Write a protein that binds this ligand. Structure first.
Ligand code: BRG
Ligand code: CA
Length: 314
DNA sequence: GGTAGACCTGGACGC
DNA sequence: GCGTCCAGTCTACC
């Protein structure tokens, strides 16, 4: 009853709502689609994960997003805590206004969007977002998900346990920069990225100026932010774009990967024109990004999130 | 300035 | 049951 993961039905008094129609958000289309890797549908239509250093379970009805938080006396999320959720899902951004616009200038988008509504971008923590995507390169979402879980279990603060699940906060820079981290990460199965994580944490803490340097890029320009991130080991064009779009408030950033290349070729008959290469390469990937920006506008990265999410569900 | 190949690690084929 | 193919970043040499 009071044990295990909560469900809206089981612990009624332990849930607070926030107005949000499925047209503004679809948990099942945002949480497991490769933006954040820390949410799990422990119970049908109920997603659990760490949000703002606390564990939460979320579920939705046609017009409501139901939230419950596990902190001592179990109580309802307060108005402030709920505000943290609104911020995570960037709810001030009207997804219906964006879909209308993109669909107005892109007939193919209008078509896909008609069946994949509620795909918006999570506003993530720079650090969590940075190392999670360092683990993403040349990998698949399912594997990346386990790597990130083992990484947080081994180096992150222990939060609380529900059923046989112990939740952990994302490791700090100091922890990731500690001694022998790479070796431990390799036993955890991160492959060659184990080096990127260790090397990137130290680089940030010992050469770039620490956490302030990262949290800073958020006020800088996409052009600025993207160049800086590429300095870090394991952070190429894609990873840096994912970070700019999902954690540094650069909504025009467009991560270019195998999925976006397939979407470009199959749904737009796109081809590189300013570059000599016929396939993926540093030059062609940059062109594709510009292409999608030119097509969708200022919030091109968000539109990209819709097609990418839709391309996974296949 | 612009490419071939190696990288870790499993699922998903295909024979 | 096995050898490939897949889901980006970094460097050789150009
Ligand atoms: N373009 C793109 N590539 C990605 N890889 C991962 Br893993 N997640 C994403 C994403 O949201 N967009
Ligand atoms: Ca590939």
């Amino acid at each position: 009853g009071s044990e295990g993961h909560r469900t809206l039905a089981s612990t009624p008094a332990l849930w607070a709502s926030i107005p949000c129609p499925r047209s503004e958000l679809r948990l099942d289309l945002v949480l497991p689609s490769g933006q954040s890797f820390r949410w799990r549908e422990q119970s049908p239509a109920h997603w659990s994960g760490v949000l703002a250093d606390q564990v939460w379970t979320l579920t939705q009805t046609e017009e409501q997003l139901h939230c419950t938080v596990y902190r001592s006396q179990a109580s309802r999320p307060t108005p402030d805590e709920l505000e943290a959720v609104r911020k995570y899902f960037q709810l001030d951004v009207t997804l219906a206004q964006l879909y209308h616009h993109w669909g107005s200038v892109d007939s193919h988008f209008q078509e896909v969007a008609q069946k994949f509504q509620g795909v918006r971008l999570l506003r993530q923590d720079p650090i969590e977002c940075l190392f999670s995507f360092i683990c993403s390169s040349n990998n698949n979402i399912a594997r990346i998900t386990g790597m990130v879980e083992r990484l947080c279990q081994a180096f992150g603060p222990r939060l609380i346990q529900l059923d046989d699940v112990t939740y952990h906060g994302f490791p700090s820079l100091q922890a990731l920069a500690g001694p022998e981290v790479e070796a431990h990460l390799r036993k955890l199965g991160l492959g060659y990225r184990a080096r990127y994580v260790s090397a990137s944490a130290r680089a940030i803490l010992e050469e770039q100026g620490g956490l302030a340097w990262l949290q800073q890029l958020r006020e800088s320009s996409y052009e600025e932010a993207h160049k800086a991130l590429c300095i870090l080991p394991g952070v190429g064009t894609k990873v840096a774009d994912c970070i700019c779009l999902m954690a540094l408030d650069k909504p025009q950033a467009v991560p270019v990967d195998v999925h976006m290349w397939h979407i470009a070729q199959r749904d737009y008959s796109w081809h590189p024109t300013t570059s000599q290469a016929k396939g993926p390469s540093p030059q062609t990937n940059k062109e594709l990004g510009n292409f999608f920006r030119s097509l969708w506008g200022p919030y091109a990265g968000w539109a990209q999130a819709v097609l990418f999410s839709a391309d996974l569900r296949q």
